[PDB]
């Protein structure tokens, strides 16, 4: 029978997860658990406080709350009721998050997949594979083009800025050096460039630009494009969530170079993140069905467990 | 303690494995098992008929005989004595090979990793991940331009062939269509061509050309160009072994496109194939130590098992 899934948290990721369940042959969406009473959806909405009343009805909880504080504090509680899958992206906290989720999931006999998505997630998997295969490798991850929320907020704090967004993009020159094994000395200020889009009165532009180009820690030292655009233009063309990146790994085998490159081009960040999250939710359920329990990163899941196809079918068609 | 490894077969792949074991922090090369008495190496060379007398001294056997004929009949015998790792590349025969290897490895309590390399191997893994994540997807694989080790070994076993290599060349138009999501229907056979370069007495050309064009799995049904050249021409222009390829997956999440691309650029095909085979060798030994036995494709191995580093270190650094 189908895996019974529910969504905790109805933001962008939760909405992406919801709409993609319809594309799954083997999953049924039971409901959304939200801290808000009224959501613009026909999916049943339940109080997050009542997850315990649906625990027997839910095989996998997709955790779609914010990573900043909500995941660390809430996720261990949810693991007592189902398998859980999160996209927790605070890399420096992932070992602790895994340990705490492992205690809770083990005690409950469930499987928690932590830190799925694309980074952490697919990029994590590609970093490890390429580094494992290529002895004495060089490796770089590049992000974007995508919105930087920290750098965007830094732009708005500039006196005179009415609206603003900042994007980070890979430097094409640094990408090409990485492909050739010659990026070893590049700093973060040389691997990426930045694009600013700012709404501001023209009388303030000279000051705002100099504020931007000499703002420390956020913009000093980077290649920065500064675009002053109209509020009408801003509200209409910068509401999307494009993202992606590259993982490039090289290694030498005695006078011979090898280049591994993994590229993602995403029109909608939470749509791809949800796609990854859903696949690892299938994995988590199957792992529990096999008798496993505890918490796992994407490094600990064999690839076939993500697929809705039978393993024998994958072997005959895709290997 | 280090994994004790040995190499069966001393062609291009076997030589690549040999030179790369020195790079591994956790492997020692015990020797080479060969059908030939005289190899140009200081590594201990043993008779392949005597592998049974080394069974307690060898944890992992790297199987580096030819795929076209040697692997199917010979590989299952070696699973009696150690974990094995092969790069068997006859996709239409991989389910059968896995099944017979699984019986042999299970009886012996060893782990057989079958069909490693880059295709099968890394490309198989990338096909499965991208197809599992992108629910509605288009996916195509492209190979080359470059020298194919399996096809080349197959040519050299044809009676009357003195020297031979095969190249595969992808349609760059089809690759561009794939990126735009417009290739959909095209197969590998429809988007590649094969070039053979063969040194043979002219009296043997008719028979050799027929053995090429009617060779199942490797050449039957492909667009194949056959070149009969002189030995001097071969020896100067056909020594390099570069290759590479692309796995391209596109998908839509409801009005938003995503592209996943995996790219290899290999200066020396057998060096990277060996790099992959070695990593899966590490994995097979570790799986055996965890209590597993039988035969597994690359789809069935958790990524962290390939790495020489501790899982905790990979999580903290790479996820
Ligand atoms: N690993 C990766 O590759 C990757 C990539 C992208 C994102 N992520 C993670 O995904 C997480 C969530 O992304 P998101 O874009 O979904 O964040 P979000 O849109 O801010 O949703 C976060 C939470 O805010 C609440 N919320 C949503 N709309 C609200 C409103 N109008 N008023 C009040 N509360 C509201 C929801 O909880 P209730 O329904 O309970 O209110 C939702 O769970 C991020 O924190 C990020 O770490 C991971
Ligand atoms: N899966 C992948 O991605 C991938 C990519 C590349 C290659 N491969 C596989 O790798 C396999 C090996 O490629 P290869 O280039 O190593 O094949 P090879 O160079 O033709 O040598 C293959 C076997 O022939 C024997 N041999 C070598 N030199 C010989 C000589 N001068 N006279 C007689 N016998 C000789 C060796 O066994 P003895 O020492 O016992 O004679 C060796 O094991 C290919 O068959 C291919 O299927 C896989």
Swiss-Prot record, chains A, B:
Record's protein name: Meso-diaminopimelate D-dehydrogenase
pH-activity dependence text: Optimum pH is about 9.8 for the oxidative deamination of meso-diaminopimelate and 7.9 for the reductive amination of L-2-amino-6-oxopimelate.
Keywords, ordered alphabetically: Amino-acid biosynthesis, Diaminopimelate biosynthesis, Lysine biosynthesis, NADP, Oxidoreductase
GO function terms (MF aspect): diaminopimelate dehydrogenase activity
Pathway this chain belongs to: Amino-acid biosynthesis; L-lysine biosynthesis via DAP pathway; DL-2,6-diaminopimelate from (S)-tetrahydrodipicolinate: step 1/1
Gene3D superfamilies in alphabetical order: Dihydrodipicolinate Reductase, domain 2, NAD(P)-binding Rossmann-like Domain
Domain of life: Bacteria
Top-level class of the enzyme under EC nomenclature: oxidoreductase
Organism from which the protein derives: Corynebacterium glutamicum (strain ATCC 13032 / DSM 20300 / JCM 1318 / BCRC 11384 / CCUG 27702 / LMG 3730 / NBRC 12168 / NCIMB 10025 / NRRL B-2784 / 534)
Alphabetical list of InterPro entries matching this protein: Diaminopimelate_DH_Ddh, Meso-DAP_DH_C, NAD(P)-bd_dom_sf
Subunit structure: Homodimer.
BP GO terms, sorted: diaminopimelate biosynthetic process; lysine biosynthetic process via diaminopimelate
Keyword Cytoplasm belongs to the record: no
Binding site for substrate: 89, 119, 143, 149-150, 168, 194, 243, 269
